[PDB]
Amino acid sequence: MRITQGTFSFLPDLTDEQIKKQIDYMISKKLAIGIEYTNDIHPRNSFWEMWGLPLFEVTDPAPVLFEINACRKAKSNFYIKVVGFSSERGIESTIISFIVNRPKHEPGFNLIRQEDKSRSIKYSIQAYETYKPEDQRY
């Protein structure tokens, strides 16, 4: 299935020209721009791996785009996303986050139902590729 984490995951995968225009947006919003990747796609996996530090005070999309592609070359079967952090007082948080690489195939999640008191159930989801070590996923 398609994982729909990300601001634009109901759209087709973005071209590089689209990705470029999203960097321009971020630049005009004065955001720090980070690139993160993971192959544990749990929705509560809050800390993806960082591909370098976030870039600050950037003024041209080129170098961001260049790292995105180098991450894609190094981690081609990982999810990779781009995140734009705001430092505006009272936000101080991500304000956009979108996918720029997905694995070829997504097998999705197992749903675990542990039966508890009365009719209640304690739930877990476990991404199928996480049943394997990281270097064997996707």
Residues of the shown chain interacting with a second copy in the complex, contacts defined by CB under 8 A: 40, 42, 44, 107-108, 110-116, 121-126, 128, 130-136
| Token digits of residue 103 | 């694995």
Angle, to 10 degrees, between the axis of helix 62-74 and the axis of helix 16-28?
130
Q: Rule CB under 8 A: choose which of 15, 59, 104, 118 binds another protein.
A: 118
23 to 37, 48, 83, 121: CA distances (angstroms): 17, 20, 10, 43
* Smaller CB separation from a second copy, 57 or 135: 135
Q: Do 61 and 20 form a contact (C-beta atoms < 8 A)?
A: yes
* Smaller CB separation from a second copy, 56 or 131: 131
| Token digits of residue 80 | 């990779």
* Smaller CB separation from a second copy, 1 or 53: 1
Footprint on this chain of another protein (rule: CB under 8 A): 1, 3-5, 7-12, 18, 21-22, 24-25, 32, 41-47, 50, 53-54, 56, 84-85, 87-98, 108-111, 115-123, 125, 127
